[PDB]
Amino acid sequence: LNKLLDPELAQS
Amino acid sequence: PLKPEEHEDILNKLLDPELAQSERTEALQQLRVNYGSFVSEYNDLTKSHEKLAAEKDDLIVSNSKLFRQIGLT
Amino acid sequence: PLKPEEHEDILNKLLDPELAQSERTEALQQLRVNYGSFVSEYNDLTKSHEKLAAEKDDLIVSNSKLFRQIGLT
C-alpha cells in the first residue's frame, strides 16, 4: 500500500 | 476584491439564526455581487494568460531551433 | 474553484429563515474554504502573469539577438 496509495496533489 | 478578514465578518454575521430576514438578504447579496466580480476579474486575466503563454511557447520553439544553429558554428 | 452556478445554490440555501443549526454552520464554513482557495489562486496566477510577461520580453530580445548572430556567420 505504502504512502503513495493516498495520492498527494499538494506535494508540489 | 474582498479581503479574507473582512469577508469573514459577513460569514460570522450570517451565523445567528435570530438575525432579521432583511439583513440576511442584504448580507447574502454582497457575497453574490463580489463573487461575480471576483470570477469576472479572475476570467479576463486567466484568458489573457492563455494568450501570452502561447506567445511564449511560440518563442520557445522558435528560439530552440535558433540555439541549434549557434552550436553549428 | 467553484462555478458561479454552484456558488449560487449555496446562497439561496442560506436564505432560508428557518434552518437547522447543523448544516447552517456546515455551509457557512464551506463558503469560507471556497473563498480561501480562490484568493490564493488569484495571487498564484498574478505571480505567473508578471514573470511570464517579463520572460516574454526576454524571449523576444533573445530571439532578435539570436537572429542577428546567425546572420553574422
Binding site: 500500500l1 498527494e8 496533489l9 499538494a10 506535494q11 | - | 464551506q30 474554504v33 480561501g36 482557495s37
Partner: protein, 434 residues
Amino acid sequence: MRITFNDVKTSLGITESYDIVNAIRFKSYVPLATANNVAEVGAGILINQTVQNDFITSLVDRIGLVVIRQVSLNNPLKKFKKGQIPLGRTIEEIYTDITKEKQYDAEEAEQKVFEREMPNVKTLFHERNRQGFYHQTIQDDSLKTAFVSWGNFESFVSSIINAIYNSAEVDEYEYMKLLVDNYYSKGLFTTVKIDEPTSSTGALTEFVKKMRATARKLTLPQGSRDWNSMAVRTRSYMEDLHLIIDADLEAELDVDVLAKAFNMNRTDFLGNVTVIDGFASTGLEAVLVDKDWFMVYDNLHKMETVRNPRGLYWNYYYHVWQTLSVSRFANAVAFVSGDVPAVTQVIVSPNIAAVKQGGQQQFTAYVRATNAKDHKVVWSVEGGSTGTAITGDGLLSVSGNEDNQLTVKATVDIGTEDKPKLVVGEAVVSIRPN
C-alpha cells in the same frame, strides 16, 4: 523501541506532509493548503461528526499500519523475521543427507542404471500460533488541543505510535522465550552439561571454554551429525550461530572472551546474541542456536476503530497474527546446568519405512549421552504378529501374510536395581503387500 516522530519511514518531510487524505476522502471544509495556517485546518476538521470520523479513521488506520509495520521490520529481532507466509507451505521439512560419493566402476554401473537415492526423511514442522490485540483509546480533547501548532500534531501521532508499538516488542521477546522453553521441555535440544557458572570465576572460565569447544565443533567443515533433533549430518557456518543467554549470567561475563569464543569482534556480536532474563525451565542457562532454527511468519496486521457517541471517544485494535515455526534440522544445544539424566533421548534412523512382506530394513540408534560412558541399546518390535523379529543389531525381518503396522522400538536403561527410567525412541514402519 522508543520511536519519535523524527523516524519518518515514508513520505516527505514537514508536518503538513500527510494532510491530504481528503483527496481519497471531504475536501470541502479543510483547506488543501501547505502553509502556516493551523487554525483553519483544525476548524475544518472539527466542524461536525462526519468529518471528524472520516479523518480520524483514515489517519489512524492507514498511516498507523504503515508506520508501525515499517518500524517493526527493522527491530533487532529482524534476523529471524521473514515476510508473509508463502502459499503451498505443505508444513513439512525436506533435508537431504550429506552422503559420500560413489567410486567410478564400469562393471558395477553396467549392471543397473535405474537406481534411486535414499529417502530424504520428511518430518513435520514445529509451529506455535500467536493472536492478540492491544486495545488503546483516544479521548476527544486530544484532537481539540492537538491543533494549536504544527508540532502538536506530530506529538499526538508519535504518542499514539509509541504507546502501541513498545508493548508489541516486549510480547515478541516473550514469545521467543516461551518457544525456547517449550522446545527444551519437549527435550529435543542436545544437552551439554555445565555447573553453576555464576558461582565462581573458575566456573565462568570453564563455561567459556565449553562454549568455545561446542561452537568450534558445530562448525566442522566435514559435518557433525551429533548436534541435531535427528541424525542428518548437516553443517552450520560460524557466522550463523545465535546465542540466547540469561541476563544475570551475561552480566558477569565481559563482552570479550565470550566474543573470542567465536571468530568475530565485539561489534559483530551485538546483533548475534539476545538477552532474556529467566528461563524457568529447571536449570537452563544459555542456548546456542542456528539462525535457520527459529523462523517467524506473519499473517494478519489490521486496524479497526469504533466510535462511542455517548462517551465521545474512540478505540484501538492492533490484531497481530503470526505462526512461529521451529525447524528440526538446524543445530541446537541446550547447555543446561542441573541434574539431567545420563541419556536424554535416543533417535532411530529411518523413522518412517515402507517394507514389503518379504523384505528387510536396517535400523540404527543414536544415543544422546551426557556422560563419557557407553550405553547399549535393546531393540524390540512391538507390533504383534508371527514371523516378525528384530536382531540385536536392529535388522528387522518381515514375514509373509501380514497386515498390521509395526513400530520399531529402541530402549536404553540408565537405572538401578529398580528401573523407573526408560528412554525410548520410536520408528513407525508401514507394510505393503506383494
